[PDB]
Amino acid sequence: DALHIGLPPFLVQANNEPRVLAAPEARMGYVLELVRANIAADGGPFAAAVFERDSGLLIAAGTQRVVPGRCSAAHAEILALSLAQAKLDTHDLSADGLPACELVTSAEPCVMCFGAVIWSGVRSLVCAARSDDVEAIGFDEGPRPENWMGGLEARGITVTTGLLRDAACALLREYNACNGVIYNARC
């Protein structure tokens, strides 16, 4: 009777508490905490958050819930964008009288999320890990169009990538190190 993806407690918490982060690094810092927490709550090493671009108010956060949620569409970007839309009560994050919105993401978007970003109404995309980083640990980005960044820019969506990339990469390599069946107390 519904499409229903449950949020683990830490994500409910993130989505409940008012929070304002002005600097790109502050915003991405927070998104990287959610990655760490999502991995500790049985999810993939990806998180994202929709902010008010100009005030830094957090609207909504998401994390990859593919396995726990039994749903291949539950990438961090889909959850973040959709929960932001559900909170603001509109399918269009650029609807009249909404502030401009920004998707802050732990990694460059896959081809699915790329499309979702375009349809979402956000005006800004801010990424940490690059596509090659993500692919290096076996997560596929899929076939995006050529010059997909230019693609976004031409729809009025500004793209920045590499923001706190080093910390992001460190979280990716930590996930990979502990993504295996032999028990490892250190994980």
Ligand X SMILES: Nc1nc(O)c2[nH]nnc2n1
- Positions that interact with a copy of itself (CB under 8 A): 1-7, 12, 15-16, 66-67, 69-74, 78-79, 81-83, 85-92, 110-116, 118-121, 142-146, 148, 151
Complex with ligand X: residue 45 or 101, whichever CB lies closer: 45
CB atoms within 10 A of CB 173: 14
Interacting residue with ligand X among 34, 77, 83, 103 (CB under 6 A): 77
Q: Please state whether 156 falls in left (phi above 0), alpha (psi between -120 and 50) or beta.
A: left
Backbone angles phi, psi at 49, to 5 degrees: -145, 135
Name the CA radius of gyration of the chain, rounded: 16
Binding mask 130-169 toward ligand X (x if CB under 6 A, else -) reads: ----x----x-x----------------------------
Rounded distance, CA 30 to CA 130, Å?
18
The neighbouring-strand residues paired with 127 are 105
| Residues recorded for the chain | 187
Residue whose token pair is 């998104």: 31
139 binds, among a copy of itself, Zn ion, ligand X, none (CB under 5 to 8 A by kind): ligand X
Backbone angles phi, psi at 103, to 5 degrees: -95, 110
76 binds, among ligand X, Zn ion, a copy of itself, none (CB under 5 to 8 A by kind): ligand X
Interacting residue with ligand X among 27, 53, 75, 144 (CB under 6 A): 75
Residues engaged in binding ligand X (CB under 6 A): 44, 46, 64, 66, 75-77, 107, 110, 113, 134, 139, 141
